């Protein structure tokens, strides 16, 4: 229970104004109808995003912090898999993942 409270706090920080300039691509599910994304679901078998993670915390779907962390890392991994490594969204992902990993390590 205490683990999951910390997970909620980590996600709240990831949604916070101070990180918004690089966190915003991850707020909502990737829009697969947008121009250029017609192949997203062919490449990414398990989409994930911060609003879906929030809804799962609110439904108590995660039984512990490790399950929550797996979905956060899935979100970042999907970004690293789909996009070219030099893409601006990958640099944003690395920054937000640093925010996450330092908090998740220290809970």
């Amino acid at each position: 229970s205490e683990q999951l409270k910390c997970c909620s706090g980590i996600l709240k920080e990831m949604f916070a104004k101070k990180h918004a300039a690089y966190a915003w691509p991850f707020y909502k599910p990737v829009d697969v109808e947008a121009l250029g994304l017609h192949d997203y679901c062919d490449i990414i078998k398990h989409p994930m995003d911060m609003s879906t993670i929030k809804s799962k915390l609110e439904a108590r779907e995660y039984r512990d912090a490790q399950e929550f962390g797996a979905d956060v890392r899935l979100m970042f991994s999907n970004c690293y898999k789909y996009n070219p490594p030099d893409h601006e969204v990958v640099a944003m992902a690395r920054k937000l993942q640093d925010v996450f990993e330092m908090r998740f390590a220290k809970m």
């Binding site: 691509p25 121009l35 250029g36 994304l37 997203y40 789909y82 996009n83 601006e88 969204v89 944003m92």
Partner: peptide
């Protein structure tokens, strides 16, 4: 894939 983002 994804375009230049910035918003």
């Amino acid at each position: 894939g994804k375009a230049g983002k910035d918003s």
